[PDB]
């Protein structure tokens, strides 16, 4: 019976202290990406020294950054940009290449 919107402020906005009124996020400073009840808009991400800016912040979408360079984001750690391995070690062949979303892939040359 009830809606996705129902009860909530729209994206690009945040709810007020008063529990009713919807206040707009500031383009560039902050953002809000879904029908929500956020007390404040989320601070827009600023791209890191070791990053490249693929999108600027809107009120409905956070800044999109990427490692680029010759580096990649590591998932198991904090999500930070490590430098890609240049080459595969001895006995192993390069099977994937350095992306912003991944280090090179090595695999055995079917030895041992």
């Amino acid at each position: 019976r009830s809606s996705p919107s129902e009860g909530l402020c729209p994206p690009g906005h945040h709810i007020s202290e008063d529990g009713r009124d919807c206040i707009s996020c500031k383009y560039g400073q902050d953002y809000s990406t879904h029908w929500n009840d956020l007390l404040f808009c989320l601070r827009c991400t600023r791209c890191d020294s070791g990053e490249v800016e693929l999108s600027p912040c809107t009120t409905t979408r956070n800044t999109v950054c990427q490692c680029e360079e010759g580096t990649f984001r590591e998932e198991d750690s904090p999500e930070m940009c490590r430098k890609c391995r240049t080459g595969c070690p001895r006995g192993m062949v390069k099977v994937g290449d350095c992306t912003p979303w991944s280090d090179i892939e090595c695999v055995h040359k079917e030895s041992g």
Partner: antibody
Amino acid sequence: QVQLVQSGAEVKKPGASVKVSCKASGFNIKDTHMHWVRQAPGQRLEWIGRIDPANGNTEYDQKFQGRVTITVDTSASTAYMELSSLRSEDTAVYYCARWGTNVYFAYWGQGTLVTVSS
Amino acid sequence: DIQLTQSPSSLSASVGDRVTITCSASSSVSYMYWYQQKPGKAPKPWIYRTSNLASGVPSRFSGSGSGTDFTLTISSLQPEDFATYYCQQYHSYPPTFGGGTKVEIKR
């Protein structure tokens, strides 16, 4: 559309553990802390612990430290609480909830009847 | 922990009466949240941010309070209002609840 469906009522023996599920819909789990809360029969509400579902980062009350593991599955949009080495003292209604200093509203699960006896 | 002390434990009161429930705190608190739990049911959030009603809540209800002392007040009771009422604070870690005040009918 906002809902918090919890698991069915559990009957278990002392020492045995129990994993309680809490399935969320109609809002972003990641927005804020998911907490679990104990309520003994006709008694106080006791906060157990909280998880930041974006991080997976847990924090607990001293009473339950070492004995409760809260967890989340953002992809599934469901939170869980494992409680181990049970006692008759842990006979309670266990509630899953959402609240925080960054969101105005609070939503609560229906609760799970957990009984502990030999 | 900010320990919350709710007084009184219970209150036998009749329909149409003004009721004042207090919730004292062991240290100062920025905002206070009230819930209504009816027997065999999940707690319903009832008041947010000390004084703000939850949507669908009668105008007779009102929350108030400053630092360590807060009060829920019901200007004239009705049969829907007979339940246990808990206060909570989460602004200072960890979140803590009051021990509840059960409102019962006076006859």
